[PDB]
C-alpha cells in the first residue's frame, strides 16, 4: 500500500494525538520534531501532506468550543496549524 | 546416557553411531507418538552425551564435522531445552575443532559445508522447507539459526550464543588472514549480529561499506537481519543503535531499503505512534523520508528478492519460541538427514 503513505498517515495520527485543543508537556519536545516531520514531508508528499493538513484544519475549524478554555486552546491550535501549513507551502517548490 | 557420558574416559565409533541412531529413533517416535514428554528428554540426553563424548574421539574421526550439522539440526527443532543442548554442543564442537587445528587452512564454510555435500539431497529439501539455504548464504544461515539465542528464556544461553558468534567471526576473519573486526563479505553477518551486544563491535563500526557491500543480495540480507534483530528486541540502547544503523544504510542504500520495510512495518507503526524518543525518532524520520523519496522499486526490490534467494525464513525463524508445534513438522527431514549422515560415516 506504498507504506511511506502509511507512515505519513501515522504522522497524521501523531498530530491527532498532540492536541492543545483536546489534550490541553509530553507533546512538546517530540511534537516540534513531529511537526518538522510533516514540514519536511511537504517537500515530497506534496498532495498527500496538503490533504492531511487541510483535513486537520477543517476538523479544527468545524468545532464547538462551548467551554471557556476550549476557545483559548483552539486559538493556539489553529495558529500552530496555520504556521505549519504556511511553512510547508513556502518549502514546497513552485515546480510542484 | 548422561551418566555414561560424564563418566566415560574413552569412546568408540560404534558408541557414537549407536547414540546417533538412538537420537534418530527418538526423533522418529516424537513425530508420530504423542508421548513427547519422554522422547524430548531422551533427545536432549542424547545430545548432552555427545557434547561430552566428542572431545574424546580420535583426531582422525570423520564425525567431528558431522557433529556440527547434528547440532544445527537439533537447533532446528525449536525447543528451548533442545536448543540449549544444541548450543552447548556447538560450543564444544567449535572448541574441539579449534584445539585440533583444523580451521587453520580452511574457512568455516569450507569445512562444515564440505561434509554435507555428499548427502546434500535431503539437506537441500530440509533447507528449502525451512528457508535457510546454506548453499545460498552459509554464514547468514548460521547467523539466522544462532539468532534465537537472544530470544531464549534462560540468560545463560544468550552468553553462549554470543561466545559462539565471537568464535565464528574470529575464525572467519583469521581464515582470510585479516583483522578480527575487519568488515568483509563474510564477516558482515557476524559483525551485525554482535554489534547489538559487544561493546568492541559497537566501536569499530564503516558498518555499511559501499565499496565492499556492492552485491545487492548481501546488503539485502544484512538489512533483513538487522530488521529481524530489531523487531523482537526490547533493549533501548540496542534499539537506538539498530535504528541509527538502519537509517545510515537507507541513506547509503535507498534501493534495497524498500524490501526490508515490510518486516519493519509493525515496528515503525508502533514507534511512530507511541515512541517519544527524539533521538530514535530522528533516524526513523529520515528512513521514512528516504522511503517516500523513492517510489520506483519493482518486485525484484521486494521480499521476493530474498524469497528467490531461498532465505525467506530469516524474517520468521528468529522469533519467539513456540510450544511443541513445529517439532513434528520438519522431523521427517531431520530424521532422514540423520539416517543419511549415519549411513555415510558408519
Curated annotation (Swiss-Prot), chain B:
UniProt superkingdom: Eukaryota
Subcellular compartments: Nucleus; Nucleus, Nucleolus; Cell membrane
Tissue: Detected in brain, peripheral nerve, lung, colon and muscle.
Post-translational events: Ubiquitinated by RNF7/RBX2, leading to its degradation.
Domain remark from Swiss-Prot or TrEMBL: Binds phospholipids via its C-terminal CRAL-TRIO domain. Binds primarily glycerophospholipids with monounsaturated C18:1 and/or C16:1 fatty acid moieties and a phosphatidylethanolamine or phosphatidylcholine headgroup. Has lesser affinity for lipids containing phosphatidylserine and phosphatidylinositol.
Quaternary assembly: Interacts with HTR6. Interacts with SPRED2.
The protein's role, per its UniProt record: Stimulates the GTPase activity of Ras. NF1 shows greater affinity for Ras GAP, but lower specific activity. May be a regulator of Ras activity.
Disease implication from the record: Neurofibromatosis 1: A disease characterized by patches of skin pigmentation (cafe-au-lait spots), Lisch nodules of the iris, tumors in the peripheral nervous system and fibromatous skin tumors. Individuals with the disorder have increased susceptibility to the development of benign and malignant tumors. Leukemia, juvenile myelomonocytic: An aggressive pediatric myelodysplastic syndrome/myeloproliferative disorder characterized by malignant transformation in the hematopoietic stem cell compartment with proliferation of differentiated progeny. Patients have splenomegaly, enlarged lymph nodes, rashes, and hemorrhages.
Name of the protein described by the UniProt record: Neurofibromin
